[PDB]
Amino acid sequence: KGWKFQGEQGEFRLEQPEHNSYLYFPLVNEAGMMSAVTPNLHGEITSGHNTFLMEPVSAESLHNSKASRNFWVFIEGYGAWSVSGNSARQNAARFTGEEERSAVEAGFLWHAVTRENEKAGLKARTVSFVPVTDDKIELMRVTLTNTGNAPLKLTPTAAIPLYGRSADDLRDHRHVTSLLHRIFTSEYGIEVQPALSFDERGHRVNKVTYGVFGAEAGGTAPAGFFPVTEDFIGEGGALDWPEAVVANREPDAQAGTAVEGYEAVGALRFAPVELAPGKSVSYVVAMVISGDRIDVGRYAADYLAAGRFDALLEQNRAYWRDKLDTVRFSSGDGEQDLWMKWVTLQPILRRLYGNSFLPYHDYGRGGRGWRDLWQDCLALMVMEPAEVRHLLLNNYAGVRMDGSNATIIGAGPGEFVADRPRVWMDHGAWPLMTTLLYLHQSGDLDLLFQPQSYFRDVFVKRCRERDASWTPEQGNKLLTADGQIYEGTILEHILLQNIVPFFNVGEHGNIKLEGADWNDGLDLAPERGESVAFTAFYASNLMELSELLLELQKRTGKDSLDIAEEMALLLDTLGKPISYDSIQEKRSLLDRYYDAVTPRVSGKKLLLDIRKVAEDLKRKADWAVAHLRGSEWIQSKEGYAWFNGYYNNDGERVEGDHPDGVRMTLTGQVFAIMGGVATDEQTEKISQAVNRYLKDERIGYRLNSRFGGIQQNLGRAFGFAFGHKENGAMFSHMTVMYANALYKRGFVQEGFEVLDSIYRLSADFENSRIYPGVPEYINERGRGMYTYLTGSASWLLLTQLTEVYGVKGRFGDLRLEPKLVQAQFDGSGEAAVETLFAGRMLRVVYRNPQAAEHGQYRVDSVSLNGQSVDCQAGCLIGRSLIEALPADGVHELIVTLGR
Amino acid sequence: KGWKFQGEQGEFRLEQPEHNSYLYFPLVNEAGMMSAVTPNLHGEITSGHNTFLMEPVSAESLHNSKASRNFWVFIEGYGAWSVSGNSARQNAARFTGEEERSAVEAGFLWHAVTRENEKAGLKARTVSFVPVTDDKIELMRVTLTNTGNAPLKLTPTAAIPLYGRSADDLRDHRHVTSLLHRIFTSEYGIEVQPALSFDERGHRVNKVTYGVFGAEAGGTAPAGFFPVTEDFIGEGGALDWPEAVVANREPDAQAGTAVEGYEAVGALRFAPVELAPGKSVSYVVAMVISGDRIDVGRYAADYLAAGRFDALLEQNRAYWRDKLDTVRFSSGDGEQDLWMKWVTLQPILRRLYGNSFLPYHDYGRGGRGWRDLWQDCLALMVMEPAEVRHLLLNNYAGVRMDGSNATIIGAGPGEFVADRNNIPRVWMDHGAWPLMTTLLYLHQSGDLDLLFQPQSYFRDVFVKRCRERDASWTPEQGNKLLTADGQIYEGTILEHILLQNIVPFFNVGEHGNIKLEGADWNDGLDLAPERGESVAFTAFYASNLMELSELLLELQKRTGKDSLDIAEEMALLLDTLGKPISYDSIQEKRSLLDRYYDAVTPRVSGKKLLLDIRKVAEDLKRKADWAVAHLRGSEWIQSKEGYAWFNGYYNNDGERVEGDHPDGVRMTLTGQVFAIMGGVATDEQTEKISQAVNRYLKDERIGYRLNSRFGGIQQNLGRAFGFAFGHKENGAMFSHMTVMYANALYKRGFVQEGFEVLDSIYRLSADFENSRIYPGVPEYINERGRGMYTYLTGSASWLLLTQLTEVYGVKGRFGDLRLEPKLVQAQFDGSGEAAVETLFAGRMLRVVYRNPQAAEHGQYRVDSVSLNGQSVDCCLIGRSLIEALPADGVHELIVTLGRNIS
Ligand SMILES: O=P(O)(O)O[C@H]1O[C@H](CO)[C@@H](O)[C@H](O)[C@@H]1O
Ligand SMILES: O=P(O)(O)O[C@H]1O[C@H](CO)[C@@H](O)[C@H](O)[C@@H]1O
Ligand SMILES: [Cl-]
Ligand SMILES: [Cl-]
Ligand SMILES: [Cl-]
Ligand SMILES: [Cl-]
C-alpha cells in the first residue's frame, strides 16, 4: 500500500508510514532553515554545515538513533506515549501485528503525522512546517483528541533534542564540545548558545543561538523545563524512553535558570489537562536558529500567540501554491500530472538546500558547483525568469583564458575562489546549452555582447602546470600586458570553452577525459582517457554556434565579432589552416595558444567576419561528426550497434564485446543523439542497443552494463556495487537527457517509453519506497535513492514542457510543436499545459478530437482568448502577440489538431 | 548501590548496571584489537582510526544508538528477548519498577553480563574478552540456562552490527561508502571486505576484512545468516527490534552467498533448541579484523572449537595476572589495595589504546605525543624495566638544537615526522619532563653511562622554536641536524638534556619568567603565545637546573668523570664560563638566545668543546639560584584575606593572572605543584601554599580543583575557560595535577597533607553514586562528582609511582635501594603491617613495614631490616645485596619500625 493523492493540488496520504525504512520529507524556506522530517518525526534541522540545531544524520540514523523530535503524553491509566510512535513501548509492537494505526499526509510545503491509541482512546495529529517568514524557524503543532467515552487526564511534554554546533563535532570532540554549551531558560523555553565553537574553522567565539519554545493553543507558557539531556532521560535512560516522562517527574528548571557544560534538550512540560470526550487540546512548538541571543518575546508574539500557527500555515500553503502554479500539466494520466507538481518543486529545493542537508545527502556543505550555476537557470527560466540574465552574466566570470573554469563558488555575484587541482572536461559544454535556451525563451541576443572578465589563479594550461610568475599580487582576474583587467564578450567566453576542447585530443583523436566528464566517477583516466561521449556534445555545440552566428547576422545585421587576438590562433581556418586529421598538430596549436595567453594577454582585439568565424566553427564540427561516425561507431558480434563512449587510462576502447558481457554506457549515446552526431539510422540502432543491453525490466534504463569488479584504469564508480549511484543504476538525470534527445530527434514513442519508465519506477512505492518526486537514482532493488535534490527534476520539467507538450521559444517567439502520444489525451480529447512565457501565463490546450497518434496529426488552427492567430516543424507565434495580452490572469491558447 | 569487589584479585560485581548512564569497560590486546563494552553490550570495536569493525561512538551514542552487540533468543510463549536487555521491549521496562534482574562482573581482563527473564524462566550470561593471541579478535560466549519447571524451546540469533571502515565515514559519505561493501558468507559466518576505502587518506583499494563468526558450544555451525542490515531489521525496523528475530523469519543466506553494496550485520541464526529444566546451552561468537580475507577454517579451529573459549579465557586471566603481579599493595585499607590494581592496569591500557578509541576519548586517532614517550617510561620502570633504556635513548632523537622537539611520533624506534605545511605549536613544558623521567631511570638502574650515549637531533623546516621557517631547508637534507661538512651531528644524551633546560632559562617574557609559548602542561592555556608566561613551569626548569648541577657533581664523585663533550655553539649559553651576561636583564638574556639560534641555524659547525664538569655545574647552579631568588622575590603573592601562594601565569596582555580579582580570587593548582616538588617553595612557603590550596581550591564535594573560577571566557589566556567550570582543564578535579600535588607534598615531608590529597582521589573515584565509574582513576572528577575520561589517563602512572616511591618509600638512589616509609598509622593492617611487592634491580621484593607500637608518621624510625632471614646493614641498601638474591621467587624484606627517643 503506497501513498495516494488526495484532492487536485498534490496533497498525498500514506497509511502505516513508519512500516517503510528511510522515508523523509523536506521543509525549507528562503531565510535558510533546512529540515527533514520522517514518519516518527526524526530527521534533522540546520541552517548550514556549522549550525545544526538537531544532530547531523545519514540514512542509517533514521532507524538507529532514538533522538527524533518528540512529543509525549503521560496518559493516566496507560503511562508514557509518543505522538509519533517513537517510544520504546510503541516500537516494541512493530512486527507483532499489534501496531497502532498511523498515517502521514503532506502537501506544499507541510507534513502531518497521525496516530491512534485505541487502548486509551486518544488520537494525535502533529503538523510540521517551515514558515515563509524571514526567520530560520520550524513550527510543530500537536493536537490531542479524546476518542473515548470518559474524560482523559494527560500530562504533555515536548522534547526536541538539541545539538547546536558544527557537523564536524559529530564524534570528533563531540564530548569536549558539549562542555562549551550554555543553556538559558525563559518563560516560553530554552536557548543554547555555546560560548565557543571548535570545528574545522578553528576555535572561535560563538554567538549563534538555538531555541526551542512552546505554548498551549491559547498562548499559555510551559509549566516548566528539563533542559539538560542526561537529567531528562535519567540514569540509564534514552530519548525514546526518558525518565522525566516515563516516571512523570516534576520539572527541573523554571524560567531564568542557566546551566553550563551539558548536552541540551528542548523539553517543555505543559500543564496537565483534563480532556473531555470528543474534544481536543493543541500545543505549538518552535525551533529557532539565530545569529545571537533570541528575542523570545517577539518570537512568542509572532509564532506562539493564539492563531499564529494556523495563519502562518495558510501563508506557507499560498506561497508554495503560487510558486508551483507557474507550471501545470493536465492530461489523461491524472496521477502523473500530480506527480509532476512534486517534480516541479524539486529545482527550488535543490537551490534552497544547496544540494545538502537531507539524510542521504550526508556529505554536502551547502555550496554550489560550476554545474549548478547553469543548471539552476533551467527551472528559473520557466518559473521565475527575472533573475536569469544577471545569473548567466555573473557565471561567465568563472571562465579561464584556457576554456577551463573555477570550481569553487564564492559568496558574492560572480565571485569565484582559487583552491587551497581537477578539471572536468564537460564543464565547458553546459554553458552554451543553458545560454541558448535563454536566448530562445527571451529573444535577448544582446546578452552575447556584454563584457566580462576571466578568472585567473595559479593553475594554467587547464591545470597541467603551475604558473611560475604568480603571486598574491596578481589577483583573481586575467590581466593585460599593460596591467588592466581583460574583458571580453560573453560570446568570446563561449567560443573559448568550445574550441579549446576541440584541440585537446587524446591518442585516439577524441577529446580528453581529463579529471572526469558528467560522470564524476570516471576519475581514474586523466593521462590517456577520452570522453567520446562529450566529444559528440562539443561537436554539436560548435555546429550550433556556427548556426547562431549566421542567425545573428540575419536577425541583428551584426557583421563582426570582437575577439582577443590570441584566440585567432585557434580559429586557424582564417589564417594558415592546420590538418585536423593530425593529433600532433592540434595539440601543438593548443600549446602555442596557451603560451600566447600565459601569464597575461596582450589586451589587443581583432575584429573578425562573423561568416568566416561561422565557417571555421562548421569545419571543426564537420570534422568531429565525420570522425565519430567513421571511428567510434561500434558493433557487437550479435549485431547491435552504438557509439563507443570512452577510452580508459591504458588507451583502450571501453565499450563493445568483453568477457562476462557486453560493455555499454548510456552516456556515450545521449549527446550523439541530442546533437546530431548520430544519423536517424544510427539513432534507431542506438535505441535498439539501449533496450537490449541497458533496459532492465525491474529497474529501467541503466547508466551502463556490468563491468566485473573494480576498474582502476577508468574510475572509482566501479567500486560501487552494480545497480547503485554511477555504477549501472537507473540514473535519472542521464535517462531524462536520453529521453530529451529522443524527443528532439522525433523518436517520440521511444522517448515516451523512457519518461514513462521514470515515473512508473518512482511511483511504484512497494519497490521505490519514496514519496512523490523523482529520485537521483533507482537502485538494484528498485529503491528510490537521494530524493528531492537531484538535477534530474530540472531536466524532467524542461523536457515535459519544451519537448513533450512542445511549448518553447525560438529567438523569443513562441513555437508550439506537440509530441504527445494518443494515450496522453484525456476523456474529452485534450491535453493542456499552463506555463509562463514572455511575462504572461498561457494555458496551451491541445485538442485531438480525431484521436490521431503522433505522426498522424498536425496543427489545424490556433485561437488566443477567442480570436484567430497567424502561425508563420510546428506552429510559430510572434512574441508581440503574447506581450500585448493583459498581465493578470491565465490566457487560453487553443490548438486544434487534425489528421 | 555501587560495585563491590569479590575475592582478592580485583574482580568486581555491579547489580543493575544499566541503571547508570555512560558506563563502559575496556578489552584490548597487544595485537591491536581495541574494544569497549557497556552493560547492554554497546561500545565499539576497532583496530585503528581507519578500521572500525563496529560504528565509532562517543558518550551519547551509548544510550542513543540501538546498535549494541546483541544476542537474541526467540522464546516460545514469550517472543524476542535480548540477553543484554537491549530490546525495545526490555528497555520499555526502565523506570517502571518492572526491570529484569541484571549484573556486570569483570576482572583482568574480561567482562560478564547476566540477565534473568522471570516470566519465561530463562537466565543468560554473556562473557566478553580479547584473547592474548596474535590476532585482532574479540570473543563472546553466551550461556542460556532454563531456571523454570518445564522445557523451553528457543531460537538463537547473534547480531553484531558492522561498520567496517574509517571513522571519517561516520556521516561524511556514510551512505556512499556503504555501496563499496562486499559481504561473503561461509560456514561459520560473515566477512565484509569493502572494495575501496574513501576517507582522509584518499580513494584507495581496500583488502581489510571484518568478520563475525560463531558456533554452538559443541562446534555446530550456524543454521544461516542475515548479512544485510536493512533485511535483518526489516522495513521500519531497528537493531533493538529487528523483524528477522521478532517475527522469527527463516535465514536470508547460507554459506557461499555474496552480497554487494549494503550495510552489513553479523547476524548468525543458530538451530532451534529444546532446553531442559536446569540445563544450559552455550554459543561462541568471534569478531575479527584482518589485513586481507580471513582464513575462516583456521579461526574456527582456533576460537570456535569445543573448549577453545574457556582455554583462551584462562590464558587471558593468567597473562593479565602476570602483568599486574609486578606491583602489589597490602595495607589496612583492603578496598583501596584492590582499587590500586585497577590503577596499575591503566598505564598498560594507555599504551595499547594510544589514548584513543574509548567512548569519551572520541578525538584520538591512536598516535603518541611527546609527553607520552616519557610518561610511558614511568610505569615501565616499575612493571617492565627491560625496555626503558632503549626507549629513553630513542626519545632524545626528537629534540631540536633549539631545545624544542618534534611533536608527531612515527612508526619506527626513534622515528619522528616533520609537518612542513602546518605551523606547529611549541609546548614550553616539553623540555622539562625528559630530565625528570631520565633521573628516575638513573636512580632505579644506576646506569649513569646512559648520559654519554650518542644521539642525533631532529631537524625540519621550523627554526628558533618554530618562530621562523628556514629558507635553506630541502627534502634531500633529511630529518636530522647536519654539520658544516654535511655529516649528521651527534651529541651525548647529556648535551640534549642541558639544551632542553638552558634554552627555556633565556626564553623570558616581559615579567622575567619563562614564556608560555603555545601552552604548558595545560593544553587549554593556548591563547597567550605572544606575551604569556608560565611561572608554574619556570619553577620546574629552575629545579631541573639545580638537579642537573647536583647530578654533574655526583657524576664526578662517583664515576671520576671530569669533562663534558658539548657542541661549541652551546658555550654561548653557558655564559658563566666565558663573558657572563646579567641575568637581571631580560634584553641581554633574549639577545644571547638570538645569538645562539643564529650560531646553530641552519647547521652546527660539528666542532665540540670539552668543559670542566665542575664549571658547567657552577653555571647551572647560578642559573637555578637566579631563578629561585626571582620567583621567591617577585612571584610570591598574597590575597587581602591573608593567604599566600605562587602566581602561576601572565596572560597575553602581560597581566598577572593570579591574586585578588572582581568576583573572586584567581588561583591555579599548577602554579604551586612544581614550586613545591622542586624546592622553589621554602618549607614555610609550602605550608602557606597548602593553606591557600585548601582555602581556594579544595571543594567539599569534588576535591582539589585545578583552578578557582574565572568568570566567563578568557580569550587572552586559553580556550580552557570556554569549558563550564568544573570540567576538563577549567576547574575540575584534574587527577594528573592533583596526584602531582600529593607527590610534591610527600617529597617535602608534608605527609598528612599528601595523604589527604591521595585519599580524596580514591574516595571520589570509588563513591559510585556520584562517580558512576568502575574501579580506576578517571582523568577528572567533574562539577557533579562524575568520573570522566576513564582508564587512559596519565594520572594512573603518577598515582602508581607516588604510592610506590613516596608513600611506601621504596625507590632507587643511584641504583642502591632506599627505604623511607611515609605511611600514616591508619594505613597499617590488623597485624600492624603494610607491604608492597615490587621489582628492584631484577628481583621481586616484598617490602614489609611492621609498626607494632602503632606509631604515627613522625613518631617512628627504622629499628632493623632483615632480608630472606638475615640481618642487613644500612635507610639505604647496596645494590649488590639485592643482586646476590636468587632470580626466582619473592624475597621478603622486613623493616621493623619503632618509636623515637626524647
Ligand atoms: O544532480 P544529480 O541527479 O544528483 O547528479 C549528480 O551526479 C552526476 C553524475 O556523477 C553529476 O553530473 C551531477 O553534477 C551530480 O553530482
Ligand atoms: O593523561 P590525562 O590525565 O588524560 O591528561 C591529559 O590532559 C593534560 C592537561 O591538558 C595533558 O597535560 C596530558 O598530556 C593529557 O593530554
Ligand atoms: Cl503494550
Ligand atoms: Cl559543498
Ligand atoms: Cl512486558
Ligand atoms: Cl592521534
Distance of CA A847 to the CA centre of its chain: 34
Cβ contact, residue pair A710, B18, below 8 Å? no
Q: How was this structure determined?
A: X-ray
B520 is in an annotated binding site: no
**What separation in angstroms does the CA of A558 have from each of A446, A551, B525?**
11, 9, 70
A791 lines ligand 1 (CB under 6 A): yes
Residue nearest to atom 4 of ligand 1 (CA): A790
Per the CB < 8 A criterion, the answer to whether A753 and A561 are in contact is: no
Q: Rounded to a whole number, what is the distance in Å from the CA of A93 to chain B's nearest CA?
A: 8
Per the CB < 8 A criterion, the answer to whether B101 and B122 are in contact is: no
Question: Which of B84, B175, B709 to mutate against chain A (most A CBs within 10 Å)?
Answer: B175
B256 is in an annotated binding site: no
Q: Rounded to a whole number, what is the distance in Å from the CA of B262 to chain A's nearest CA?
A: 9
B3 is in an annotated binding site: no
Q: How many helices (H) and strands (E) does chain B have?
A: 22, 46
Distance CA B807, CA B327 (A): 14
CB-based contacts of B91, cutoff 8 Å, min separation 6: A88, A238, A240, A241, B85, B240
Distance CA B669, CA B739 (A): 11
> How far, in Å, from the CA of A79 to the mean position of ligand 3?
11
User: Among partner residues A19, A175, A235, which is closest to B59 by beta-carbon distance?
Assistant: A175
User: Among partner residues B60, B174, B722, which is closest to A362 by beta-carbon distance?
Assistant: B174
Distance CA A646, CA A642 (A): 12
Distance CA B159, CA B147 (A): 24
Nearest-10 Cα torsion for A505, A511, A516, A518: 170
Domain CATH code at residue B313: 2.70.98.40
CB-based contacts of B276, cutoff 8 Å, min separation 6: B146, B151
For residue B347, the 8-state DSSP code is H
> How far, in Å, from the CA of B728 to the mean position of ligand 2?
9
Rg over alpha carbons for chain B, rounded to the nearest Å, is 30
Chain A residues near residue B235 by CB distance under 8 angstroms: 19-21, 769
B793 lines ligand 2 (CB under 6 A): yes
Please state whether the peptide bond connecting residue B109 to the residue before it is cis, i.e. omega within 30 degrees of 0. yes
C-alpha cell at position A785: 535513492
Distance CA B321, CA B317 (A): 6
Helix (H) / strand (E) element for B666: namely: none
B522 lines ligand 2 (CB under 6 A): yes
Strand spans (E) along A79-121: 79-82, 102-107, 110-117
CB pairs under 8 A between A and B: 209
Nearest atom, ligand 1, residue A521 CA: 10
The packing angle between helices B388-395 and B433-445, to 10°, is 150
Distance CA B363, CA B353 (A): 12
Cβ contact, residue pair B181, A721, below 8 Å? yes
Beta-strand pair A784-785/A807-810:
unpaired
A134 is in an annotated binding site: no
Nearest atom, ligand 1, residue A519 CA: 10
CB-based contacts of B76, cutoff 8 Å, min separation 6: B152, B153, B154
B510 is in an annotated binding site: no
A519 lines ligand 1 (CB under 6 A): yes
Chain A residues near residue B21 by CB distance under 8 angstroms: 230, 233-237
> What are the φ and ψ backbone dihedral angles of B329, each rounded to 5 degrees?
-105, 145
Q: Rounded to a whole number, what is the distance in Å from the CA of A46 to chain B's nearest CA?
A: 15
Strand spans (E) along B727-871: 733-734, 780-781, 787-788, 810-813, 816-819, 833-840, 843-850, 860-867, 870-871
> Which burial class, exposed, middle or buried, applies to B602 when counting CB atoms under 10 A from its CB (0-12, 13-18, 19+)?
middle
A802 is in an annotated binding site: no
Distance CA B358, CA B361 (A): 5
The overall longest dimension of chain A from CA atoms, in Å, is 97
Residue whose entry in the numeric block shows the C-alpha cell 500530480: A338
> Which burial class, exposed, middle or buried, applies to A22 when counting CB atoms under 10 A from its CB (0-12, 13-18, 19+)?
buried
A733 lines ligand 1 (CB under 6 A): yes
Residue nearest to atom 9 of ligand 1 (CA): A519
Cβ contact, residue pair B174, A233, below 8 Å? no
Nearest atom, ligand 1, residue A732 CA: 3
Nearest ligand, CA of residue B346?
A: 2
**What separation in angstroms does the CA of B636 have from each of B678, B689, B697?**
16, 10, 17
CB-based contacts of A126, cutoff 8 Å, min separation 6: A41, A71, A83, A84, A112, A113, A114, A140, A141, A142, A143
Chain B residues near residue A21 by CB distance under 8 angstroms: 230, 233-237
For residue A442, the 8-state DSSP code is H
A339 is in an annotated binding site: no
Per the CB < 8 A criterion, the answer to whether B288 and B294 are in contact is: yes
Q: Rounded to a whole number, what is the distance in Å from the CA of B194 to chain A's nearest CA?
A: 9
For residue B420, the 8-state DSSP code is S
Breaks in chain B (C–N beyond 2.5 Å) sit after 874
Chain A residues near residue B57 by CB distance under 8 angstroms: 171
Cβ contact, residue pair A66, B67, below 8 Å? no
Per the CB < 8 A criterion, the answer to whether B529 and B466 are in contact is: no
> Which burial class, exposed, middle or buried, applies to A364 when counting CB atoms under 10 A from its CB (0-12, 13-18, 19+)?
middle
Distance CA B55, CA B167 (A): 8
> How far, in Å, from the CA of B171 to the mean position of ligand 4?
14
The overall longest dimension of chain B from CA atoms, in Å, is 97
Nearest atom, ligand 2, residue B735 CA: 3
Residue whose entry in the numeric block shows the C-alpha cell 572494495: B195
User: Among partner residues A171, A241, A363, which is closest to B58 by beta-carbon distance?
Assistant: A171
> What are the φ and ψ backbone dihedral angles of A837, each rounded to 5 degrees?
-140, 130
Cβ contact, residue pair A719, B196, below 8 Å? yes
Nearest atom, ligand 2, residue B371 CA: 14
Residue type, B175: H
> What are the φ and ψ backbone dihedral angles of B736, each rounded to 5 degrees?
-60, -45
C-alpha cell at position B462: 621550523
Answer positive or negative: Cα dihedral of B175, B177, B182, B188. negative
Resolution in A: 1.8
Task: Determine the residue of chain A that is closest to B197 in CA distance.
Answer: A719
Distance CA B173, CA B155 (A): 37
Strand spans (E) along A100-169: 102-107, 110-117, 122-129, 136-146, 152-161
Instruction: Kindly report the number of other CB atoms within 10 A of residue A810's CB atom.
Output: 18
> How far, in Å, from the CA of A53 to the mean position of ligand 1?
28
> How far, in Å, from the CA of B229 to the mean position of ligand 3?
26
Alpha helices per DSSP H over B581-698? 586-600, 613-634, 670-678, 683-696
Residues with CB under 5 A from ligand 6 (ion): B 365, 367
Q: Rounded to a whole number, what is the distance in Å from the CA of B64 to chain A's nearest CA?
A: 5
C-alpha cell at position A691: 533496450
Distance CA B121, CA B78 (A): 10
C-alpha cell at position B488: 649528521
Distance CA B41, CA B54 (A): 12
Q: Which residue, A137, A59, A486, is CA-closest to A295?
A: A137
Per the CB < 8 A criterion, the answer to whether B185 and B225 are in contact is: yes
Alpha helices per DSSP H over B205-289? 229-233, 243-246
Distance CA A735, CA A840 (A): 31
Distance CA A247, CA B768 (A): 23
In three state form, how does the secondary structure of B137-176 look?
Answer: EEEEEEEEEECCCCCEEEEEEEEEECCCECHHHCCCCHHH
Residue nearest to atom 2 of ligand 2 (CA): B793
C-alpha cell at position B535: 611561572
Nearest ligand, CA of residue B99?
A: 5
Distance CA A186, CA A164 (A): 18
Question: Which of A65, A81, A171, A766 to mutate against chain B (most B CBs within 10 Å)?
Answer: A171
Per the CB < 8 A criterion, the answer to whether B818 and B864 are in contact is: no
Residue type, A550: L
Chain B residues near residue A724 by CB distance under 8 angstroms: 179, 261
Strand spans (E) along A323-364: 327-330
Is B526 in a helix, a strand, or coil? Answer: coil
Q: Which domain holds residue A263?
A: 4-327
> How far, in Å, from the CA of B718 to the mean position of ligand 6?
22
Per the CB < 8 A criterion, the answer to whether B631 and B539 are in contact is: yes
Please state whether the peptide bond connecting residue A109 to the residue before it is cis, i.e. omega within 30 degrees of 0. yes
C-alpha cell at position B390: 632503549
Instruction: Kindly report the number of other CB atoms within 10 A of residue B149's CB atom.
Output: 8
Q: Which residue, B53, B37, B49, is CA-closest to B137?
A: B53
Cβ contact, residue pair B715, A205, below 8 Å? yes
